[PDB]
Amino acid sequence: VMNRLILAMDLMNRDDALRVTGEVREYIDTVKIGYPLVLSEGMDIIAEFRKRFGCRIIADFAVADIPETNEKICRATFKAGADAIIVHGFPGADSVRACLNVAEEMGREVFLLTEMSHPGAEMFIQGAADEIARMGVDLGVKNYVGPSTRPERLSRLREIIGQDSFLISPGVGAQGGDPGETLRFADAIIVGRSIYLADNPAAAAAGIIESIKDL
């Protein structure tokens, strides 16, 4: 990923989202689009972004349903032009497999969300996260998400998935995570508010990249 930095584009207005993404496009090659934008502007926003910016799009849909519904969600998401989809592992192996099957058929990728970055992840997800990661490995998952806010957990995640697997990490900036420390373990960092709420998003992105280059 260009500069190891993925923009989390969670503005809810098409005009604001396009403005900020355009301002920072020189510093990224990958945009994570989630439900805040999609549910406000429609699934057509994915193909609009892919065309206008020539970026890769990861659909962060935190997919967390039964296998049959997961199948339908992934089909709709890839039809809309997404390059990859984020899928929760907590619901279990059959729900993850359903997503992997659709990605295989459609020539796309699944990212497995292991531990989440916010405080409430400590209640239930953290105690299952090592096993969720090991399930991922067993299923042949090659792309994972884990938390910038807990680099010791990110290290343990990396330990389970190996060096060949690709690991991206949210929680940098607003949630308290640090770019450089997170990039000790993750291949790329996800950054939302620290860039898209900044008075100057391009300057915020540039500032992050300057600290990344220094690594």
Next chain:
Amino acid sequence: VMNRLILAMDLMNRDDALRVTGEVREYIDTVKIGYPLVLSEGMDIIAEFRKRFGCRIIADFAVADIPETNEKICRATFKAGADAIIVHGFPGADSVRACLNVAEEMGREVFLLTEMSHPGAEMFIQGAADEIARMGVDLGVKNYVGPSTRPERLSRLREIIGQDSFLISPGVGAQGGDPGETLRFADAIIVGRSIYLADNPAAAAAGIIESIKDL
């Protein structure tokens, strides 16, 4: 809920979804709309259904993100006209609270998904589900979802949430659950494929209701 039966409308085509919902409208007063339909036809489908059928709409979006993103998802969903939203408890109390805060502000309801109905729920969710339910009670949640496929787990869920709380239950029909047994513990059952894939959905719905009335 009319006849204690909620239609899970997971067809992906607006014309098919409207046809089937119209055919069974005399037997329900509540439709669960999820991502298969929304991501295929847009969020405007919610207000279309609410107008055309005068039904209540539960948005089954299995909300499973960090508090700030959950807030945005709930805001977009209620703006679209949903009466209630389904929210995972597995991510923890702060993520659930975020949804409860938006529901309070917008005069809507949150349903907390405890244990899921599919086989993979046994891996991670089932071992946390009692505690997820108890978290719900502590947060003041009054509406819950639990699995038709495991009535002993549905009983234990009901035990935790009490008789005043409202409990709806998917997994009836296609996934192997039974209407009558599930209604021993749940207030209403959710049914998707057994109705919407039937050669005659109205006859399928009527058949279910006839077995419900007999209880």
